[PDB]
Design a protein around this ligand. Structure first.
Ligand SMILES: NC(=O)c1ccc[n+]([C@@H]2O[C@H](COP(=O)([O-])OP(=O)(O)OC[C@H]3O[C@@H](n4cnc5c(N)ncnc54)[C@H](OP(=O)(O)O)[C@@H]3O)[C@@H](O)[C@H]2O)c1
Ligand SMILES: Cc1cc(CC(=O)O)n(C)c1C(=O)c1ccc(Cl)cc1
Length: 316
């Protein structure tokens, strides 16, 4: 058994997920070994995406742990994400089908709209003109969502959701005429320096699960993250809490999310930190401790993706 939450479509999501993004200089081989370790350690929720360029490896890990009797497919919750070069409705299903072929899985548990700003169709994830300008595309996300709904109806994705949506863009989906399925989640940056209370409360009021990424303060990979930004795991209050509970600042930060009703992702390619992260289920925080963590909030957004700034659908 393991801790899950009931999503608004009746499906269940394990409340701790393993993140599989690594900076490109990290060889892809490490993704295979890390996912296997995450499964061995007790992760039952694995988070990937087309744009991470690791689905062949992450799929192999999963296949391998099923084929060796370590786990059953129904006890893995696997998430992929529709990249912005495939927002046009007629491209959505082929994108999912391509991810499924790379993975050699029959279905994904969750398929998200990865980012709300669209770019031109093609193999290139960030297509650029001869002058280096990003090739933006104009697409109605409500049609993109209809095509997601059809992928759910075909059993290719058991659930569908969004990522890096803001209040306006969620409402756009929720208030859509002929809406068949709400998004089960909104996967966004969330951690003690950016606790997203406002958007969290919104998602709760609509029974949408907030899934927290960069819950440990992110890769801090340049140019995506300003190396001046504060180091989450170095916070004195988190480090004090960690010492007091004989845990780590990372564990405190993960536990914080679980108790506030957020599903939390943790990336690590390190065998010891992978095993350590599942200890989030071994302790609990008091109301006073949770309030202290709430006080760390400083509106620090690490991941702006501001190369996609300009178009109306840029969410930040
Ligand atoms: N939807 C989106 O747009 C989006 C955006 C960003 C991320 N994500 C998803 O969210 C996942 C996680 O976010 P993210 O990669 O920024 O990083 P995240 O998990 O905050 O972690 C950042 C760093 O923490 C380290 N770490 C892990 N456990 C630790 C521990 N117990 N003690 C000290 N350090 C620890 C990792 O290094 P080691 O590997 O060396 O342990 C990693 O570099 C991604 O892998 C991806 O699946 C989605
Ligand atoms: C697009 C994108 C968005 C995210 C945020 C996330 O979900 O973590 N990542 C990590 C990427 C890439 O991997 C990426 C791949 C190829 C190129 Cl050229 C640029 C970025």
């Amino acid at each position: 058994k393991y801790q899950c939450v009931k999503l608004n479509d009746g499906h269940f999501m394990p409340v701790l997920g393993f993140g599989t993004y690594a900076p490109a200089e990290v060889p892809k081989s490490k993704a295979l070994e890390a996912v296997k370790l995450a499964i061995e350690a007790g992760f039952h929720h694995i988070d990937s995406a087309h744009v991470y360029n690791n689905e062949e490896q992450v799929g192999l890990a999963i296949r391998s742990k099923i084929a060796d009797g370590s786990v059953k497919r129904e006890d893995i919750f696997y998430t992929s994400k529709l990249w912005s070069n495939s927002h046009r409705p007629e491209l959505v299903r082929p994108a999912l089908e391509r991810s499924l072929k790379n993975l050699q899985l029959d279905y994904v548990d969750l398929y998200l709209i990865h980012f709300p700003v669209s770019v031109k169709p093609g193999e290139e994830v960030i297509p650029k003109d001869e002058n280096g300008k990003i090739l933006f595309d104009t697409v109605d996300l409500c049609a993109t969502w209809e095509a997601m709904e059809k992928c759910k109806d075909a059993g290719l994705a058991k659930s569908i959701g969004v990522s890096n949506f803001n209040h306006r863009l969620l409402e756009m989906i929720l208030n859509k005429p002929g809406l068949k399925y709400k998004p089960v989640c909104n996967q966004v940056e969330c951690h003690p320096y950016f606790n997203q209370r406002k958007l969290l409360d919104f998602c709760k009021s609509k029974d949408i699960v907030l899934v927290a990424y960069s819950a440990l303060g992110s890769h801090r990979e340049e140019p995506w993250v300003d190396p001046n930004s504060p180091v989450l795991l170095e916070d004195p209050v988190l480090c004090a809490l960690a010492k007091k509970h004989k845990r780590t600042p990372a564990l405190i930060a993960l536990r914080y999310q679980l108790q506030r009703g957020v599903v939390v992702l943790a990336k690590s390619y390190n065998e010891q930190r992978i095993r350590q992260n599942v200890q989030v289920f071994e302790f609990q925080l008091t109301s006073e401790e949770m309030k202290a963590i709430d006080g760390l909030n400083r509106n620090v957004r690490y991941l702006t993706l501001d190369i996609f700034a300009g178009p109306p659908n840029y969410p930040f």
